Design an enzyme around this catalytic site. Structure first.
Site, short mmCIF file in Angstrom:
data_model
loop_
_atom_site.label_atom_id
_atom_site.label_comp_id
_atom_site.label_asym_id
_atom_site.label_seq_id
_atom_site.Cartn_x
_atom_site.Cartn_y
_atom_site.Cartn_z
N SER A 199 42.70 19.40 4.81
CA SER A 199 43.04 18.80 6.10
C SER A 199 42.46 19.61 7.26
O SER A 199 41.24 19.68 7.42
CB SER A 199 44.55 18.66 6.25
OG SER A 199 44.88 18.33 7.60
N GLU A 327 45.10 8.08 1.76
CA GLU A 327 45.11 9.12 2.78
C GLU A 327 46.18 8.87 3.84
O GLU A 327 46.98 9.77 4.14
CB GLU A 327 43.73 9.21 3.43
CG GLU A 327 42.73 10.06 2.66
CD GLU A 327 43.03 11.54 2.79
OE1 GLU A 327 42.47 12.33 2.00
OE2 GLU A 327 43.82 11.92 3.67
N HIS A 440 48.56 12.33 1.15
CA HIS A 440 47.78 13.43 1.70
C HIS A 440 48.21 14.77 1.12
O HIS A 440 49.40 15.08 1.06
CB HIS A 440 47.94 13.44 3.22
CG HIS A 440 46.90 14.25 3.94
ND1 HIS A 440 47.21 15.42 4.61
CD2 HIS A 440 45.57 14.06 4.10
CE1 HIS A 440 46.10 15.91 5.15
NE2 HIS A 440 45.10 15.10 4.86
O1 LIG Z 1 56.78 16.87 -3.52
N1 LIG Z 1 56.73 15.66 -4.13
C1 LIG Z 1 55.56 15.05 -4.10
C2 LIG Z 1 54.35 15.71 -3.40
N2 LIG Z 1 53.79 15.09 -2.31
C3 LIG Z 1 52.71 15.60 -1.63
C4 LIG Z 1 52.15 14.81 -0.39
C5 LIG Z 1 53.17 14.49 0.76
C6 LIG Z 1 53.00 15.25 2.11
C7 LIG Z 1 51.72 14.82 2.95
N3 LIG Z 1 50.85 15.91 3.45
C8 LIG Z 1 51.26 16.97 4.34
C9 LIG Z 1 52.32 16.84 5.24
C10 LIG Z 1 52.66 17.95 6.08
N4 LIG Z 1 52.02 19.12 6.06
C11 LIG Z 1 50.95 19.30 5.17
C12 LIG Z 1 50.23 20.55 5.12
C13 LIG Z 1 49.18 20.75 4.25
C14 LIG Z 1 48.78 19.70 3.39
C15 LIG Z 1 49.45 18.49 3.42
C16 LIG Z 1 50.54 18.25 4.30
C17 LIG Z 1 52.13 16.82 -2.06
C18 LIG Z 1 52.68 17.48 -3.17
C19 LIG Z 1 53.79 16.93 -3.84
O2 LIG Z 1 54.34 17.56 -4.93
NA NA Z 2 49.08 17.42 6.97
#
Ligand SMILES: O/N=C\c1nc(CCCCNc2ccnc3ccccc23)ccc1O
Ligand code: NA
Ligand SMILES: *[C@@H]1O[C@H](CO[C@@H]2O[C@@H](C)[C@@H](O)[C@@H](O)[C@@H]2O)[C@@H](O[C@@H]2O[C@H](CO)[C@@H](O[C@@H]3O[C@H](CO)[C@@H](O)[C@H](O)[C@@H]3O)[C@H](O)[C@H]2NC(C)=O)[C@H](O)[C@H]1NC(C)=O
Ligand SMILES: CC(=O)N[C@H]1[C@H]([C@@H](O)[C@@H](O)CO)O[C@@](O[C@H]2[C@H](O)[C@@H](O[C@@H]3[C@H](O)[C@H](NC(C)=O)[C@@H](O)O[C@H]3CO)O[C@@H](CO)[C@H]2O)(C(=O)O)C[C@@H]1O
Ligand SMILES: *[C@@H]1O[C@H](CO[C@@H]2O[C@@H](C)[C@@H](O)[C@@H](O)[C@@H]2O)[C@@H](O[C@@H]2O[C@H](CO)[C@@H](O)[C@H](O)[C@H]2NC(C)=O)[C@H](O)[C@H]1NC(C)=O
Ligand SMILES: [Cl-]
Ligand SMILES: [Cl-]
Ligand SMILES: [Cl-]
Ligand SMILES: [Cl-]
Ligand SMILES: [Cl-]
Ligand SMILES: [Cl-]
Ligand SMILES: [Cl-]
Ligand SMILES: [Cl-]
Ligand SMILES: [Cl-]
Ligand SMILES: [Cl-]
Ligand SMILES: [Cl-]
Ligand SMILES: [Cl-]
Ligand SMILES: [Cl-]
Ligand SMILES: [Cl-]
Ligand SMILES: [Cl-]
Ligand SMILES: [Cl-]
Ligand SMILES: [Cl-]
Ligand SMILES: [Cl-]
Ligand SMILES: [Cl-]
Ligand SMILES: [Cl-]
Ligand SMILES: [Cl-]
Ligand SMILES: [Cl-]
Ligand SMILES: [Cl-]
Ligand SMILES: [Cl-]
Ligand SMILES: [Cl-]
Ligand SMILES: [Cl-]
Ligand SMILES: [Cl-]
Ligand SMILES: [Cl-]
Ligand SMILES: [Cl-]
Ligand SMILES: [Cl-]
Ligand SMILES: [Cl-]
Ligand SMILES: [Cl-]
Ligand SMILES: [Cl-]
Ligand SMILES: [Cl-]
Ligand SMILES: [Cl-]
Ligand SMILES: [Cl-]
Ligand SMILES: [Cl-]
Ligand SMILES: [Cl-]
Ligand SMILES: [Cl-]
Ligand SMILES: [Cl-]
Ligand SMILES: [Cl-]
Ligand SMILES: [Cl-]
Ligand SMILES: [Cl-]
Ligand SMILES: [Mg+2]
Ligand SMILES: [Mg+2]
Ligand SMILES: [Mg+2]
Ligand SMILES: [Mg+2]
Ligand SMILES: [Mg+2]
Ligand SMILES: [Mg+2]
Ligand SMILES: [Mg+2]
Ligand SMILES: [Mg+2]
Ligand SMILES: [Mg+2]
Ligand SMILES: [Mg+2]
Ligand SMILES: [Mg+2]
Ligand SMILES: [Mg+2]
Ligand SMILES: [Mg+2]
Ligand SMILES: [Mg+2]
Ligand SMILES: [Mg+2]
Ligand SMILES: [Mg+2]
Ligand code: NA
Ligand code: NA
Ligand code: NA
Ligand code: NA
Ligand code: NA
Ligand code: NA
Ligand code: NA
Ligand code: NA
Ligand code: NA
Ligand code: NA
Ligand code: NA
Ligand code: NA
Ligand code: NA
Ligand code: NA
Ligand code: NA
Ligand code: NA
Ligand code: NA
Ligand code: NA
Ligand code: NA
Ligand code: NA
Ligand code: NA
Ligand code: NA
Ligand code: NA
Ligand code: NA
Ligand code: NA
Ligand code: NA
Ligand code: NA
Ligand code: NA
Ligand code: NA
Ligand code: NA
Ligand code: NA
Ligand code: NA
Ligand code: NA
Ligand code: NA
Ligand code: NA
Ligand code: NA
Ligand code: NA
Ligand code: NA
Ligand code: NA
Ligand code: NA
Ligand code: NA
Ligand code: NA
Ligand code: NA
Ligand code: NA
Ligand code: NA
Ligand code: NA
Ligand code: NA
Ligand code: NA
Ligand code: NA
Ligand code: NA
Ligand code: NA
Ligand code: NA
Ligand code: NA
Ligand code: NA
Ligand code: NA
Ligand code: NA
Ligand code: NA
Ligand code: NA
Ligand code: NA
Ligand code: NA
Ligand code: NA
Ligand code: NA
Ligand code: NA
Ligand code: NA
Ligand code: NA
Ligand code: NA
Ligand code: NA
Ligand code: NA
Ligand code: NA
Ligand code: NA
Ligand code: NA
Ligand code: NA
Ligand code: NA
Ligand code: NA
Ligand code: NA
Ligand code: NA
Ligand code: NA
Ligand code: NA
Ligand code: NA
Ligand code: NA
Ligand code: NA
Lengths: 536, 534
Positions: A199, A327, A440
């Site tokens: 990101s 995304e 994401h």
């Molecule tokens: O946990 N259960 C499911 C799960 N879902 C995700 C994605 C959902 C969050 C979306 N993405 C971000 C939001 C806020 N801050 C960030 C900072 C760095 C990278 C991504 C993000 C990742 C790992 C997981 O295991």
């Molecule tokens: Na993010």
């Protein structure tokens, strides 16, 4: 233990040995690479940490830089995993180094991780960034640094000496310079440093490519779900000033000039005060937009990221880019009308038409009608399921996929060897709902080998899938090619080119070469759309 | 035969007993319905034919109106079939009446055919317009007319009483008035007249819908591969005057409008024809110099405006298109196109062809057309670029103007039935990359396969007989699927939401949805908003 004691140029460290089911790893967590950017140093570029005395306790992660903690869904792992796991502090410029427990007698390639948090959050101490598995499995050197986020790292009064902007990127560059001078003390090859980030971290990696002073600090680059030419990664000098001057008014700030006095007043406010008024700075209601991001001031970037991409020679450079399959699905639940994690988020056309203006802010009504034209199924223009997935594509293509495809096609056609992927793997039962697919930042834990953690509950096939991904990233860091050199039988990952537009799909199944990274959609965003704003 | 002598208000007629494989048909060809528009009457509205003494010979077709003759493919069956097959003359305002040989006892629905040749050509005497199998297999009176085309029928100096324009449409209107007062003498029902036409003829049918004076001259309408709201079917009074004066300067011609028309009358008929295409502003395809004009008399407003708010409730309309509407036109101007080679154009020829297929639009507008119609995974593929430009010309000029018309009539109370003709004729001389080209369903509508002289396919003969019954079931009842057959699929009406149409080919009825919906949303909705904001 004596391998847990290393002497860098500044002083001596006392490391800690981490236990991986495959073996031990030597870790050095919380190494200061800059003097604490507090007081008069707030908003200013970092300067190197002066030599210390004694032995620095490098056995745990240091503080997280001051940032907004998202309180959207409390106690929900999908959002809590990105929140700070250490205390907030402006004394946060520390880096971490993982190295194999038998310290490499021959210099190995170095992987430098740059976390992404929309340039307003993130930390190198998050559990999904643990580099013990990536190092133990592939015998590489993993470095991750903290950099100032939010206004503390990207508040810019363009021109003034007291708030030049992009100091968060200079935190990264200073950490990269620290790697060039000290990674050899851990068994790493300074001439084989590969940047990788996700990101905003991927956008940061992309900006070190386009910044000459940083280009001599690394060899290869990996951009995961982010690009410096995205509509969210930069602001102009005018908007940066309008945003910084506004934040000063929210906190009550009336031979110092008016800019010098503005910064001097901002430096009196406690750090938590500036954080509480950050999101009140954005122009309009929007999604996937952030208040304080890198600025095109001229110093760090000669021009806009798009201008530096086009008129640039990238021979002798290997770049690995990729996105997740879905995304924009996450960013809809945060701000889009009618979207929620818990109620399937079936939306009406009125909510869809409203969501287009939030997902694509600061565009003419004619431009918004163009977006509605392409992302509407005019045979079923009111089907809520199609409208939900269409708006997820609107935010996904506009912010991530098409910036990545535009960058990749340009780098591949201007000297670079580019490999592209699409992470398509999603657990059978994930914390997030199904309609959001692969959201994401879901590829990070598999890239870092987190499924290999015995305490987590991953499928045995997912552990094999993670080890294969770690091999791809390590092979790219070692040779510039994700494929195994002495294995012509394995599924070939061809380089991405502007014409063939080849990429592979990353999931449980073997590599499948696909063609076109949203080619029809990204022709609109990258080619036709920009000529609409100029003409109208 | 006693069935070949009919008397109209003008006088007595003498017909010919035409022979079909199913039975005989009484025909009356070359009936004068107007005074010859020659000399001072050139460019003027038609005058009704004054009565005559004696018996008018109605056994042969009359002269074709002066028009351009296609000479770019000499001898080629595909183009010569549309070229005039009789003598060219400004004395051409004649009509033809076909009727079943045993004249029907009860009033019979009347089909009125309006030929379409881009308003610059055409004739009711062509072989594909031979109405003898339709009139024999369905026993419905068929009337066809000749109307002035080119400058003789559509040159308009707006405001001038010497060239008010639309006189070719007034030729059609005067023929419809002739039908209202004389078709009963042939066994026809004046209260059940169904107009049907192709291309410019379909556009002409649509304009009779939008012109109140014509609404009392027919009951139902059929529009085949044409619509009045097409970008080629009308011009404004400003463009109509610039094209009129430009033609005068090219033939050497100088109130100032009265002397200008007088000079044009002195010029020979063929001289005007030689300079008709030169008055077009840009190099273009599917564009014609002299078309109907929005003058406020025949068309009180633009056809797209007359469609939004009109008298359409209860009106039965049958619309449809062919599978490849734009392929035929590309051999007349598009770079790198010819019927002899596969026309595998490069991208440089594709982009140039867009500016000639979509003329009179801004630079930004043309790039929106390059989008949507470009496969950005294979933007250099010549086979795709060729087939894509076929869609551009077909959608912009035919498919989407028709879809817009059908959707808006249905939304205002009209019973609309839509089709897509997609059977390539076995006797078709055009290449295979043209698919089912423009204007090649008329053969099957008129039952030309039934002609033993032609070497059509056995199952193409029953396919034609099925289409003739569909068109006949529309003229009689207003519903093409009149047979209450549970064994045969039903033809659902076209609506603005469902947007259902049927496919016409050897296979039985297949009900589809979406008449190029994703593409026509660009042409009918976004592109107009793009032009008014650029
Ligand atoms: O946990 N259960 C499911 C799960 N879902 C995700 C994605 C959902 C969050 C979306 N993405 C971000 C939001 C806020 N801050 C960030 C900072 C760095 C990278 C991504 C993000 C990742 C790992 C997981 O295991
Ligand atoms: Na993010
Ligand atoms: C497909 O064929 C078309 C039509 O060309 C004509 O028919 C062919 C079957 C051959 O007999 C040709 O010799 C014949 O001309 C060709 O398309 C090309 O169109 C271009 C427009 O971009 C024209 O090129 C220019 O035209 C004139 C007249 O020849 C010259 O001054 C120039 O040198 C230049 O050629 C031209 O009409 C025609 N091509 C040529 C070579 O004359 C073309 O050959 C082919 N096109 C494809 C496959 O894309
Ligand atoms: C530019 C043009 O002059 N404007 C008029 C035009 C008309 O002049 C042409 O039709 C002449 O060929 O179009 C309008 O036509 C209406 C016509 O005036 C009106 O009159 C009919 C018709 O004369 C008929 N013919 C008989 C044999 O003499 C006669 O029965 O009387 C009238 C019907 O009862 O009828 C209208 C409906 O048919 C039109 O044809 C049209 O309104 O635009 C009139 C324009 O002023
Ligand atoms: C799905 O939920 C959204 C989000 O609303 C939140 O979550 C809901 C489950 C419920 O607890 C709401 O009160 C929460 O605010 C709904 O959209 C909101 O609807 C509420 C009700 O009036 C209102 O605050 C806003 O208009 C909407 N706000 C936003 C940001 O969308 C939506 O209606 C739900 N959809 C369905 C199909 O049930
Ligand atoms: Cl929960
Ligand atoms: Cl976690
Ligand atoms: Cl985020
Ligand atoms: Cl800006
Ligand atoms: Cl500005
Ligand atoms: Cl602002
Ligand atoms: Cl806001
Ligand atoms: Cl956000
Ligand atoms: Cl995708
Ligand atoms: Cl982009
Ligand atoms: Cl190379
Ligand atoms: Cl091989
Ligand atoms: Cl091999
Ligand atoms: Cl391989
Ligand atoms: Cl290979
Ligand atoms: Cl694609
Ligand atoms: Cl795709
Ligand atoms: Cl696509
Ligand atoms: Cl797609
Ligand atoms: Cl030709
Ligand atoms: Cl003759
Ligand atoms: Cl034609
Ligand atoms: Cl009547
Ligand atoms: Cl009517
Ligand atoms: Cl009627
Ligand atoms: Cl138009
Ligand atoms: Cl027009
Ligand atoms: Cl005169
Ligand atoms: Cl003459
Ligand atoms: Cl003359
Ligand atoms: Cl033109
Ligand atoms: Cl013409
Ligand atoms: Cl009715
Ligand atoms: Cl009616
Ligand atoms: Cl179609
Ligand atoms: Cl041509
Ligand atoms: Cl032409
Ligand atoms: Cl046009
Ligand atoms: Cl599209
Ligand atoms: Cl309406
Ligand atoms: Cl034929
Ligand atoms: Cl039948
Ligand atoms: Cl469709
Ligand atoms: Mg020590
Ligand atoms: Mg190891
Ligand atoms: Mg290099
Ligand atoms: Mg850009
Ligand atoms: Mg930008
Ligand atoms: Mg506030
Ligand atoms: Mg967020
Ligand atoms: Mg948010
Ligand atoms: Mg906005
Ligand atoms: Mg914008
Ligand atoms: Mg569709
Ligand atoms: Mg989704
Ligand atoms: Mg361009
Ligand atoms: Mg001629
Ligand atoms: Mg222009
Ligand atoms: Mg539409
Ligand atoms: Na949870
Ligand atoms: Na929970
Ligand atoms: Na979050
Ligand atoms: Na997790
Ligand atoms: Na191995
Ligand atoms: Na953009
Ligand atoms: Na921007
Ligand atoms: Na931009
Ligand atoms: Na921005
Ligand atoms: Na922004
Ligand atoms: Na901006
Ligand atoms: Na501002
Ligand atoms: Na503080
Ligand atoms: Na806020
Ligand atoms: Na906000
Ligand atoms: Na807001
Ligand atoms: Na958002
Ligand atoms: Na946001
Ligand atoms: Na290279
Ligand atoms: Na390189
Ligand atoms: Na939001
Ligand atoms: Na913006
Ligand atoms: Na903005
Ligand atoms: Na704008
Ligand atoms: Na579209
Ligand atoms: Na589309
Ligand atoms: Na679509
Ligand atoms: Na974009
Ligand atoms: Na490449
Ligand atoms: Na989980
Ligand atoms: Na859930
Ligand atoms: Na992850
Ligand atoms: Na391998
Ligand atoms: Na392999
Ligand atoms: Na290979
Ligand atoms: Na390769
Ligand atoms: Na490209
Ligand atoms: Na894709
Ligand atoms: Na796709
Ligand atoms: Na692309
Ligand atoms: Na798409
Ligand atoms: Na743009
Ligand atoms: Na007879
Ligand atoms: Na006359
Ligand atoms: Na033919
Ligand atoms: Na004439
Ligand atoms: Na015609
Ligand atoms: Na005949
Ligand atoms: Na017939
Ligand atoms: Na009317
Ligand atoms: Na009626
Ligand atoms: Na139009
Ligand atoms: Na046109
Ligand atoms: Na003109
Ligand atoms: Na002559
Ligand atoms: Na001449
Ligand atoms: Na020309
Ligand atoms: Na031309
Ligand atoms: Na044409
Ligand atoms: Na008006
Ligand atoms: Na009305
Ligand atoms: Na009616
Ligand atoms: Na009715
Ligand atoms: Na088709
Ligand atoms: Na043709
Ligand atoms: Na020609
Ligand atoms: Na031509
Ligand atoms: Na030409
Ligand atoms: Na497209
Ligand atoms: Na085609
Ligand atoms: Na439509
Ligand atoms: Na309507
Ligand atoms: Na076809
Ligand atoms: Na038969
Ligand atoms: Na019937
Ligand atoms: Na019947
Ligand atoms: Na009928
Ligand atoms: Na509709
Ligand atoms: Na479709
Ligand atoms: Na289509
Ligand atoms: Na629209």
């Amino acid at each position: 233990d004596a391998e847990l004691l290393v002497t860098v140029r500044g002083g001596r460290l006392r490391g800690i040995r981490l236990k991986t089911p495959g073996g031990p790893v030597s870790a050095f967590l919380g190494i200061p690479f800059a003097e604490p950017p507090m007081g008069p140093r707030r908003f200013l570029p970092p300067e190197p940490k002066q030599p210390w005395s004694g032995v620095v306790d490098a056995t745990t992660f240091q503080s997280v830089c001051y940032q907004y903690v998202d309180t959207l869904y409390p106690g929900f792992e999908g959002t809590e995993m990105w929140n700070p796991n250490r205390e907030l502090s402006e004394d946060c410029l520390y880096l971490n180094v993982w190295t194999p427990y038998p310290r490499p007698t021959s210099p190995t390639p170095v992987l430098v991780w740059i976390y992404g948090g929309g340039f307003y959050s993130g930390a190198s101490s998050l559990d999904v960034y643990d580099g013990r598995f990536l190092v133990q499995a592939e015998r590489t050197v993993l470095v991750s640094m903290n950099y100032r986020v939010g206004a503390f790292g990207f508040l810019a009064l363009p021109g003034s000496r007291e708030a030049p902007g992009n100091v968060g990127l200079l935190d990264q560059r200073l950490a990269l310079q620290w790697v060039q001078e000290n990674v050899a003390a851990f068994g790493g090859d300074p001439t084989s440093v590969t940047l990788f980030g996700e990101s905003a971290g991927a956008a940061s990696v992309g900006m070190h490519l386009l910044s000459p002073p940083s280009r001599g600090l690394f060899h290869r680059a990996v951009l995961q779900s982010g690009a410096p030419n995205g509509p969210w990664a930069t602001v102009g000098m005018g908007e940066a000033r309008r945003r910084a001057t506004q934040l000063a008014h929210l906190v009550g700030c009336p031979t110092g000039g008016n800019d010098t006095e503005l910064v001097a007043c901002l430096r009196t406010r406690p750090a938590q005060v500036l954080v509480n008024h950050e999101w009140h700075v954005l122009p309009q209601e929007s999604v996937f937009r952030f208040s304080f991001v890198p600025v095109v001031d001229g110093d760090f970037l000669s021009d806009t990221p798009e201008a530096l991409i086009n008129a640039g020679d990238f021979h002798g450079l290997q770049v690995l880019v990729g996105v997740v399959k879905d995304e924009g699905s996450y960013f809809l639940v945060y701000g889009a009308p009618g979207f929620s994690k818990d109620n399937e988020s079936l939306i009406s056309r009125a909510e869809f038409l409203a969501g287009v203006r939030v997902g694509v802010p600061q565009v003419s009504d004619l431009a918004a009608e163009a977006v509605v034209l392409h992302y509407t199924d005019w045979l079923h223009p009111e089907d809520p399921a199609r409208l939900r997935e269409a708006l997820s594509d609107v935010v996904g293509d506009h912010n991530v996929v098409c910036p990545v495809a535009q960058l990749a096609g340009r780098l591949a056609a201007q000297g670079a060897r580019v490999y592209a992927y699409v992470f398509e793997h999603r657990a059978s039962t994930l914390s997030w709902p199904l309609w959001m697919g692969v959201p994401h930042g879901y590829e990070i834990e598999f890239i870092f080998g987190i499924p290999l953690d015995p305490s987590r509950n991953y499928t045995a096939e997912e552990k094999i899938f993670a080890q294969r991904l770690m091999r791809y990233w390590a092979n790219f860091a070692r040779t510039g090619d994700p494929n195994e050199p002495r294995d012509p039988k394995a599924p070939q990952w061809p380089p991405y080119t502007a014409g063939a537009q080849q990429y592979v799909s990353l999931d449980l199944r073997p590599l499948e070469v696909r063609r076109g990274l949203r080619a029809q959609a990204c022709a609109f965003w990258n080619r036709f759309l920009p000529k609409l704003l100029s003409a109208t």
